[PDB]
């Protein structure tokens, strides 16, 4: 008997991906889900997780690669590795030099999800839905306050987003940038933010309970699709703003103590087949990292510039740099101060 234990994000695979794989290979898949980088990272650090494959964000690889939790990927066992987009491989390679440990899986940005109808009512037909001004100017948040404003509970992405908006380095290594100008703007915005949460905005957007959110691209598009399936007339859309946004990448990695390496490699190469990962993108509304798969993705998804951004939008994206622990601790304390007062 052959078995394979996978640990992936919630809502990050198609409903029949595992079943198709099991039909094709005869391998028993045990599939478990998390919904936070810290829950996965806290299992990885305790060791002996029992997982053969896990899906961390690329920025979390650097911290974990120095701890020696993953083992290098045998490229010869992945003949379809050549299907991966080389540009995405280079961006992930900033956290994983020579792409030794991680296979790019899906990627997206952190932008603005919003209720199209609610925003136009409150802010007029010319609401700045293409700008962070929509959610980072107090004058606007005061108007959108009553219809619901939410921010991610993510100090790394929110501070980077605020810094970029103010004209600073999105990955500034200067402590005063976080406690000074970034905290000032966040404190001005705070009284108009209903909550800081990294998943409640999804269903809230879909149901009409909040009208604007800082959120992950594919999760906002899932909320938009949920409202469409529910036939509730709620029109959710998503915006990568003109000032740029953070792009991030989730990757498959193999723990060093994985018991089913052969089966793990079979599943990776399975994912590299163009139709397998195109099918996932169709259902989760995230762009996969496979360049051969792109034309196979449904037109509604691949021609959506908020999922597959064109070259001009990609040029405005920035990525997460791993900060020195000194700056991590400054970020956490300031975030706590922002969320309270």
From Swiss-Prot:
Transport is feedback inhibited by intracellular polyamines. Keywords: Disulfide bond, Periplasm, Signal, Transport. Putrescine binds at residues 10, 219, 250. The complex is composed of two ATP-binding proteins (PotG), two transmembrane proteins (PotH and PotI) and a solute-binding protein (PotF). The gene is potF. Part of the ABC transporter complex PotFGHI involved in putrescine uptake. Binds putrescine. Imports putrescine for maintenance of the optimal concentration of polyamines necessary for cell growth in the presence of glucose. GO terms for molecular function: putrescine binding. It is found in: Periplasm. This is Putrescine-binding periplasmic protein PotF. Belongs to the bacterial solute-binding protein PotD/PotF family. One of its GO terms (cellular component) is membrane. Disulfide bonds join 147-211. GO terms for biological process: putrescine transport. InterPro entries: SBP, Sperm_putr-bd. It comes from the Bacteria. It holds the Pfam family SBP_bac_8.
